[PDB]
Each structure stands twice: as structure tokens, then as C-alpha cells.
């Protein structure tokens, strides 16, 4: 799919299968991407997983999972909040919002056609709060170069007109 990173870059990745969008001390955002057509390197999201890592005093661990045709307004355990008002799910419709007040984080999930669309708003200090090992996070440093869609000649002719 198309990616807009926390660092403001825009890119188009193949990234077939499971890939971490966010992998930090607070949150995990994992996506599954499928080729839009068998031939193509154009892929789209059919699964979103979000792990709201346990935060002592605020929430217990909560897992949200959306898949094409199934966008619930609750966590995997049929729960709608944290173990008080620190973490909450809101349905708006086909269109869901997670409000992680305890971490200033908001996750927006929408089904657009046969595929999923995701957007995360997160504070800079928390989004950059991960260990050196957690270096694959598409929201932070994009997808690896090998996964990026390069036209070059075509994009260059497009910009040149």
C-alpha cells in the first residue's frame, strides 16, 4: 500500500504479508498486505492488529483486530475499554476509533472497498520510544528499499510533463 510516515515521507510499498507499522514500548500495529491482483506488486491491507501494551494503573493489555468485512467496535475479548476511561473504542461507520488517552494515541480504522485504511496520531516522544532492536516500523522509517515501488522513468516523465 501507500505509506505516510511519522517523519512525513510518502512511499508505495509492496510489503506482502505481515509487517510492523509500529513496534514500540507502548503500542504494536501489525498489518497484513495482499496483492490487489495475483500478477501485481500493488498490495492492500486486509488485516490490522493493534496491541495496547499493558500500562500499570491505566489499562490491561488490549488487542484490536479488523479484517476486511469484519471491523468490530470492541477488542478481541468483546471488551470496549481498559481494565478506566484511559482506553476506549468508538464506532462511527465501516469506521472505528481507538482512544488511548493514557498515551495520547488515536487509531482510526476504515474499510475502503475490499481493503483497510489506517491512521495513527501519536506524540513524538512516545512514537520514538523504542529499543535499537525494534528497527522495522514502517510508520517510523518506511519500508525497506527492496519493498519500495520505483517507476523513476515514468514518475520522472510525469513530473516533467
Amino acid at each position: 500500500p501507500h505509506l505516510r510516515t511519522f517523519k512525513d515521507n510518502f512511499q508505495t510499498c509492496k510489503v506482502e504479508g505481515a509487517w510492523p507499522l509500529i513496534d514500540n514500548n507502548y503500542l504494536s500495529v501489525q498489518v497484513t498486505n495482499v496483492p490487489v491482483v495475483p500478477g501485481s506488486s500493488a498490495t492492500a491491507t486486509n488485516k490490522i492488529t493493534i496491541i495496547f501494551k499493558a500500562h500499570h494503573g491505566c489499562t490491561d493489555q488490549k488487542v484490536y483486530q479488523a479484517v476486511t468485512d469484519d471491523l468490530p467496535a470492541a477488542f478481541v475479548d468483546g471488551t470496549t475499554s481498559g481494565g478506566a476511561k484511559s482506553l476506549r473504542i468508538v464506532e462511527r461507520e465501516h469506521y472505528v476509533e481507538m482512544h488511548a488517552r493514557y498515551i495520547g494515541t488515536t487509531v482510526f480504522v476504515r474499510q475502503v472497498g475490499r481493503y483497510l485504511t489506517l491512521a495513527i496520531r501519536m506524540p513524538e516522544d512516545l512514537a520514538m520510544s523504542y529499543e535499537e532492536s525494534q528497527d522495522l516500523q514502517l510508520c517510523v522509517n518506511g519500508c525497506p528499499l527492496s519493498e519500495r515501488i520505483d517507476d523513476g522513468q515514468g514518475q520522472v516523465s510525469a513530473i516533467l510533463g
Partner: peptide
């Protein structure tokens, strides 16, 4: 109590 510059991320179909 529990309540915490924002960054934005998006992933949208090809």
C-alpha cells in the same frame, strides 16, 4: 492522572 507535538501515520490501499 492516566491522561498523557503529535506525529501522524497512514496506510491506504494501492
Amino acid at each position: 492522572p492516566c491522561n498523557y507535538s503529535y506525529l501522524f501515520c497512514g496506510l491506504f490501499g494501492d
